[PDB]
């Protein structure tokens, strides 16, 4: 039984999709995968320290930066400790441990075991880490902030308790019987044929078509298409890709070799995906669950089992020329056969791996074997330092082989929870490229999620995000998610439960409000009024008393501050919500401010924000800080999600509107005035000016490399302390935004120089040449971003932007100049591109 199912109904409302359902399946791959993950799960559930799991200490092993050592002028750090409005300050060494620090306290007070939680967060300072390595601590230092801690007792591991569990040499050929659609598109008489590709990691190996026929709602061919590929030549994870043209309207896929290593036999009636108008949605083994409206195709398979010399000088240089080449530079036939003939020489350079493994004729049995023999002698790979860029490329859509991919996942095992979180989003998106539902990478995510509540928490939302918004992959992900929830342990099952209730109630309210204000620039009296009452109505006897904040799980949100909630003034009508801090030990009475928005796809934003963090940590490796401000954002459902409200901030546009705010007259001098009146001292002003030169610069480089640099004033923001930040990534040109008003804060005006500009240029160019040290990583991330998170993208030119941006294949000198010019374009255009948004109101 009875409470195996109530549970299962619980798991289904948390997941947001029913995995036990089998209405959309033509084999048993998902259920097998549900069976398959019990053990990896139970393994990690069995092997985890109950205590440390309950306290999820957030820790890093990275060096403390130069800029944060400069924040410690005494080899000594302050830490206020409280019990019940009684508290003392302790002078502590950066290398002191929480345990050790508890020795130095027990003396001071009194003349059994407790723990150091952070005042106002479900965060802890525990475990054998020197405090200098707890993330909360580094964050306090960076922002000029006092470390406040309360002395309470551990959380009880019982609360995590997991519920106990209860469970031939023939050429290949394929019979096209035909297609069926209840209702035809456009309606005139065009032309229709079927295309049947045998694919492997986007390599097309062989291809046959049918004779075309007129597009009638039922078309019949009854033809064998004989490929030349031999059955024995077919490689695991090969896809029979079936497509319809009249041109490309529909596609569906079928794994020729199933999760048991059996050739696929029998009749099939696949409901096909319809195009819109390259992209990860094109790869899915899933069929369209919409049986009533979708085009469908009918087929038959009936075809069983299966599971040196010294290299000369001037070719070495061609080989090396190739290996050095970036991830997006294409390989020639010539290239590919070079790599292959010298596969053993290539095997020594881990950088060569992606290129080498795409010089493999995967449609030849013998070659694969030699390739598997090649993988056997994996000494140099196993031993190399972990390179994420390189690891990630082997997980992209170019690699379908399970053992190539698995060595990449081998290298990720050595990542610490700190780095998993950096790449988690991108690793979840890369499940989309796995031929099978059960994969080394899917198990890795599972395993790293269960090991650590912070990874588990984000794993839940990231996966739920995709389940709710993609039919192409909701089945797969729903299976991985189910597997997570069965090991995460009852505390969390209750946490997630609270969270789902909240963000479903609030989405109702978000959408009901959009209804009332048609568009009409003004947000009405009646409008805000109805907001309040709905919120009053929800708080009254339904909403959870409290809940974790999805984009920062340390924070527990209390009641809604109904007075402060409102509707924002966009064409979309996002909610502005503020909640009380549910933690009574909180250092403040400062509300938690969340924004709910429907209208842009928030997955794009998540992805962009996450590259931003990556770019921040890349800057940590050269002791740089550009004070980026990647606010929280969790994509929750269909074109909808939540956003972190940054406190004490306004729009550039609005600082322009204050003094002028005309129809578009922009003034050079206002930004600097705004800061002064929002700086009490004149010291804190120059700090704002400082913060701004870094934040401006950071956002100039980042935004440019990503090609999201021509933005409007309104979608750029500044905090009252100089911290600048772009928002709204969902949504004559300019490379980036360095307007005359930014420039005026840098003591400069329409072609001259000055100290703070000399600084700005110094940082940009450094920031720039740095990111280029990580070219391959960024290229891989961006290219993955597009394929898994955008519309349809040109599998050359949309993607090929960034490599021209990072000015690939260039000496440092050139590239610095290249950037400097870009600044000079924004100096030439001044306000002109800014100006131009409006003017087109009628264009
Ligand atoms: C005080 C205040 O209004 N702060 C704000 N912070 C943010 C951060 C992000 C976004 C945002 C909104 C939509 C899409 N993307 C980001 C809006 C605000 S308002």
Short mmCIF file of N, CA, C and O in Angstrom, two decimals, residues 17-74:
data_model
loop_
_atom_site.label_atom_id
_atom_site.label_comp_id
_atom_site.label_asym_id
_atom_site.label_seq_id
_atom_site.Cartn_x
_atom_site.Cartn_y
_atom_site.Cartn_z
N UNK A 17 5.94 14.15 -13.49
CA UNK A 17 5.72 13.23 -14.61
C UNK A 17 5.74 11.79 -14.06
O UNK A 17 6.52 11.49 -13.15
N UNK A 18 4.91 10.91 -14.62
CA UNK A 18 4.67 9.58 -14.06
C UNK A 18 5.48 8.51 -14.78
O UNK A 18 5.11 8.06 -15.88
N UNK A 19 6.57 8.07 -14.15
CA UNK A 19 7.51 7.11 -14.74
C UNK A 19 6.94 5.69 -14.87
O UNK A 19 7.39 4.90 -15.69
N UNK A 20 5.93 5.37 -14.07
CA UNK A 20 5.37 4.01 -14.02
C UNK A 20 4.44 3.79 -15.21
O UNK A 20 4.18 2.66 -15.62
N UNK A 21 3.93 4.90 -15.74
CA UNK A 21 3.23 4.93 -17.00
C UNK A 21 4.05 4.26 -18.09
O UNK A 21 5.28 4.34 -18.10
N UNK A 22 3.36 3.58 -19.00
CA UNK A 22 4.01 2.90 -20.12
C UNK A 22 3.20 3.05 -21.41
O UNK A 22 3.29 2.21 -22.31
N UNK A 23 2.45 4.14 -21.52
CA UNK A 23 1.66 4.41 -22.72
C UNK A 23 2.53 4.86 -23.87
O UNK A 23 2.11 4.77 -25.02
N UNK A 24 3.73 5.34 -23.57
CA UNK A 24 4.63 5.84 -24.59
C UNK A 24 5.96 5.09 -24.65
O UNK A 24 7.02 5.65 -24.41
N UNK A 25 5.88 3.83 -25.02
CA UNK A 25 7.03 2.95 -24.99
C UNK A 25 6.77 1.78 -25.95
O UNK A 25 5.63 1.35 -26.18
N UNK A 26 7.86 1.33 -26.57
CA UNK A 26 7.84 0.24 -27.53
C UNK A 26 8.96 -0.73 -27.20
O UNK A 26 9.32 -1.58 -28.02
N UNK A 27 9.55 -0.58 -26.02
CA UNK A 27 10.44 -1.57 -25.48
C UNK A 27 10.50 -1.31 -24.00
O UNK A 27 9.68 -0.56 -23.51
N UNK A 28 11.41 -1.93 -23.26
CA UNK A 28 11.38 -1.80 -21.80
C UNK A 28 12.63 -1.13 -21.24
O UNK A 28 13.03 -1.43 -20.10
N UNK A 29 13.21 -0.21 -22.02
CA UNK A 29 14.49 0.47 -21.67
C UNK A 29 14.39 1.33 -20.41
O UNK A 29 15.28 1.27 -19.57
N UNK A 30 13.32 2.11 -20.27
CA UNK A 30 13.14 2.93 -19.07
C UNK A 30 13.01 2.10 -17.79
O UNK A 30 13.66 2.44 -16.79
N UNK A 31 12.17 1.05 -17.82
CA UNK A 31 11.95 0.22 -16.64
C UNK A 31 13.25 -0.48 -16.24
O UNK A 31 13.62 -0.53 -15.07
N UNK A 32 13.94 -1.01 -17.24
CA UNK A 32 15.27 -1.59 -17.05
C UNK A 32 16.18 -0.58 -16.34
O UNK A 32 16.84 -0.92 -15.37
N UNK A 33 16.18 0.67 -16.83
CA UNK A 33 16.93 1.76 -16.23
C UNK A 33 16.46 2.06 -14.80
O UNK A 33 17.28 2.29 -13.91
N UNK A 34 15.16 2.04 -14.57
CA UNK A 34 14.66 2.09 -13.19
C UNK A 34 15.19 0.92 -12.36
O UNK A 34 15.53 1.11 -11.20
N UNK A 35 15.28 -0.28 -12.95
CA UNK A 35 15.85 -1.43 -12.22
C UNK A 35 17.34 -1.24 -12.04
O UNK A 35 17.88 -1.55 -10.99
N UNK A 36 17.99 -0.74 -13.08
CA UNK A 36 19.44 -0.63 -13.12
C UNK A 36 20.07 0.32 -12.12
O UNK A 36 21.26 0.21 -11.85
N UNK A 37 19.30 1.27 -11.58
CA UNK A 37 19.90 2.35 -10.81
C UNK A 37 19.73 2.17 -9.32
O UNK A 37 20.28 2.92 -8.51
N UNK A 38 18.96 1.15 -8.97
CA UNK A 38 18.71 0.80 -7.58
C UNK A 38 20.05 0.61 -6.88
O UNK A 38 20.31 1.12 -5.78
N UNK A 39 20.93 -0.09 -7.57
CA UNK A 39 22.17 -0.57 -6.96
C UNK A 39 23.20 0.55 -6.79
O UNK A 39 23.66 0.78 -5.66
N UNK A 40 23.51 1.28 -7.87
CA UNK A 40 24.34 2.48 -7.76
C UNK A 40 23.82 3.40 -6.68
O UNK A 40 24.62 3.94 -5.91
N UNK A 41 22.49 3.54 -6.61
CA UNK A 41 21.84 4.35 -5.57
C UNK A 41 22.12 3.80 -4.20
O UNK A 41 22.59 4.51 -3.32
N UNK A 42 21.78 2.52 -4.03
CA UNK A 42 21.90 1.90 -2.73
C UNK A 42 23.34 1.90 -2.30
O UNK A 42 23.63 2.16 -1.13
N UNK A 43 24.23 1.70 -3.26
CA UNK A 43 25.66 1.81 -3.01
C UNK A 43 26.00 3.13 -2.32
O UNK A 43 26.54 3.12 -1.22
N UNK A 44 25.64 4.25 -2.95
CA UNK A 44 25.95 5.58 -2.42
C UNK A 44 25.21 5.90 -1.15
O UNK A 44 25.76 6.54 -0.25
N UNK A 45 23.94 5.52 -1.08
CA UNK A 45 23.16 5.60 0.17
C UNK A 45 23.87 4.80 1.28
O UNK A 45 23.93 5.21 2.44
N UNK A 46 24.41 3.64 0.92
CA UNK A 46 25.06 2.80 1.94
C UNK A 46 26.40 3.36 2.41
O UNK A 46 26.79 3.14 3.56
N UNK A 47 27.10 4.11 1.55
CA UNK A 47 28.49 4.43 1.83
C UNK A 47 28.68 5.85 2.35
O UNK A 47 29.82 6.30 2.49
N UNK A 48 27.60 6.56 2.68
CA UNK A 48 27.72 7.97 3.03
C UNK A 48 27.63 8.22 4.54
O UNK A 48 26.82 7.61 5.23
N UNK A 49 28.50 9.10 5.03
CA UNK A 49 28.59 9.45 6.45
C UNK A 49 27.32 10.19 6.89
O UNK A 49 27.11 11.36 6.53
N UNK A 50 26.46 9.52 7.67
CA UNK A 50 25.14 10.11 7.97
C UNK A 50 25.21 11.54 8.50
O UNK A 50 24.40 12.39 8.09
N UNK A 51 26.17 11.75 9.41
CA UNK A 51 26.40 13.06 10.04
C UNK A 51 26.75 14.08 8.98
O UNK A 51 25.91 14.92 8.67
N UNK A 52 27.94 13.99 8.38
CA UNK A 52 28.38 14.97 7.37
C UNK A 52 27.35 15.22 6.25
O UNK A 52 27.27 16.32 5.76
N UNK A 53 26.59 14.20 5.86
CA UNK A 53 25.50 14.36 4.90
C UNK A 53 24.42 15.30 5.41
O UNK A 53 23.89 16.15 4.66
N UNK A 54 24.08 15.16 6.68
CA UNK A 54 23.05 16.01 7.25
C UNK A 54 23.50 17.47 7.35
O UNK A 54 22.66 18.39 7.26
N UNK A 55 24.80 17.68 7.49
CA UNK A 55 25.32 19.02 7.60
C UNK A 55 25.91 19.58 6.32
O UNK A 55 26.29 20.74 6.28
N UNK A 56 25.98 18.79 5.25
CA UNK A 56 26.44 19.32 3.97
C UNK A 56 27.44 20.49 4.07
O UNK A 56 27.12 21.60 3.70
N UNK A 57 28.63 20.25 4.60
CA UNK A 57 29.54 21.40 4.67
C UNK A 57 30.01 21.87 3.29
O UNK A 57 30.44 21.06 2.49
N UNK A 58 29.94 23.17 3.04
CA UNK A 58 30.31 23.73 1.74
C UNK A 58 31.73 24.26 1.77
O UNK A 58 32.03 25.31 2.36
N UNK A 59 32.58 23.55 1.06
CA UNK A 59 34.00 23.62 1.26
C UNK A 59 34.73 23.62 -0.08
O UNK A 59 34.22 23.05 -1.04
N UNK A 60 35.91 24.24 -0.14
CA UNK A 60 36.76 24.14 -1.33
C UNK A 60 38.20 23.88 -0.96
O UNK A 60 38.65 24.28 0.11
N UNK A 61 38.94 23.21 -1.85
CA UNK A 61 40.37 22.94 -1.63
C UNK A 61 41.25 23.86 -2.44
O UNK A 61 42.47 23.68 -2.50
N UNK A 62 40.65 24.86 -3.07
CA UNK A 62 41.43 25.80 -3.86
C UNK A 62 42.25 26.73 -2.98
O UNK A 62 41.93 26.93 -1.80
N UNK A 63 43.33 27.29 -3.55
CA UNK A 63 44.10 28.30 -2.81
C UNK A 63 43.24 29.50 -2.49
O UNK A 63 42.35 29.83 -3.28
N UNK A 64 43.47 30.14 -1.35
CA UNK A 64 42.84 31.44 -1.08
C UNK A 64 43.47 32.46 -2.05
O UNK A 64 44.68 32.43 -2.25
N UNK A 65 42.65 33.32 -2.70
CA UNK A 65 43.25 34.23 -3.69
C UNK A 65 44.18 35.28 -3.08
O UNK A 65 44.20 35.44 -1.87
N UNK A 66 44.94 35.98 -3.93
CA UNK A 66 45.78 37.09 -3.45
C UNK A 66 44.87 38.16 -2.85
O UNK A 66 45.13 38.67 -1.75
N UNK A 67 43.80 38.49 -3.57
CA UNK A 67 42.91 39.57 -3.16
C UNK A 67 42.16 39.33 -1.84
O UNK A 67 41.70 40.29 -1.23
N UNK A 68 42.03 38.07 -1.41
CA UNK A 68 41.44 37.76 -0.11
C UNK A 68 42.49 37.54 1.01
O UNK A 68 42.14 37.58 2.20
N UNK A 69 43.75 37.31 0.66
CA UNK A 69 44.83 37.36 1.65
C UNK A 69 45.09 38.81 2.03
O UNK A 69 45.38 39.12 3.18
N UNK A 70 44.96 39.70 1.04
CA UNK A 70 45.12 41.14 1.26
C UNK A 70 44.02 41.65 2.18
O UNK A 70 44.18 42.67 2.84
N UNK A 71 42.90 40.93 2.24
CA UNK A 71 41.82 41.24 3.18
C UNK A 71 42.16 40.82 4.63
O UNK A 71 41.46 41.19 5.56
N UNK A 72 43.22 40.03 4.81
CA UNK A 72 43.70 39.63 6.15
C UNK A 72 45.10 40.22 6.40
O UNK A 72 46.12 39.69 5.93
N UNK A 73 45.16 41.31 7.16
CA UNK A 73 46.42 42.00 7.46
C UNK A 73 47.06 41.57 8.79
O UNK A 73 47.96 42.25 9.29
N UNK A 74 46.63 40.43 9.35
CA UNK A 74 47.05 39.99 10.70
C UNK A 74 47.30 38.48 10.87
O UNK A 74 47.56 38.04 12.00
#
